[PDB]
Amino acid sequence: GPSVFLFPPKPKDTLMISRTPEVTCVVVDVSHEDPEVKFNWYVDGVEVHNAKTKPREEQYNSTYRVVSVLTVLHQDWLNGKEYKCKVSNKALPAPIEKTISKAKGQPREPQVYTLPPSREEMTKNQVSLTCLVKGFYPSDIAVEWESNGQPENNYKTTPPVLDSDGSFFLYSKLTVDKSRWQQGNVFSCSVMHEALHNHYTQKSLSLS
């Protein structure tokens, strides 16, 4: 039978007003004989009708995947409203209902620190710029890199890791050509989190 997974919006989408957060209801293991899926969305218990169903997609395992996307208001999600997805399909004896909401708990402000490359790494053609983000809650967070107002395209960020005090931390590793670092170019670690002022902060990183 079909299975349902309800996903929250991306942290960056709910924190930046210029973006559109969405909750996503994914129905997997949809059969070829009964591929019709009906979605019923509810925001705080009242049904809404602005959801969009994406065309079904057959997967490599020979089952259909149908996705429904519902735009949400930034403040509704941040204030803890519940979003219910109800999925109906003739292969199910009864509809499946999944509910999600923002993670609960006292918000805690991330501490953001930039770390230059180890001197021992300066013998490599590329060097690692590190961003330490620690002490934040909930774990929902977004991290990006910038230089001169433009995005950097070779960084990787670890998942949030639970620390001893109940908060979370992570690292972001930006790889740049060693020449760029030695020339004094300024790089910026951008962190987006609900417990930050304006929901974002930036910290610079340069040689001297």
Partner: protein, 65 residues
């Protein structure tokens, strides 16, 4: 390019304690649906963000117990 004043107006309005949800909800919507774009240029200028925030802060202070 990030609209810092718009983002800040969103954050400040989001945390004004004395506004009810409906009022805070109406102000935030005006940041992205033209209502705040007083000079119909399609972009929320710094003047409009500060003025909409200042106007939203005004109602919050008038509602302080």
């Amino acid at each position: 390019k990030l609209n810092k004043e718009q983002q800040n107006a969103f954050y400040e309005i989001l945390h004004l304690p004395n506004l009810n949800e409906e009022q805070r909800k109406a102000f935030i919507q005006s940041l992205i649906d033209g209502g705040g774009d007083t000079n119909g240029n399609g972009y929320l200028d710094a003047e409009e963000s500060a003025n909409l925030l200042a106007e939203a802060k005004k109602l919050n202070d008038a509602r302080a117990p």
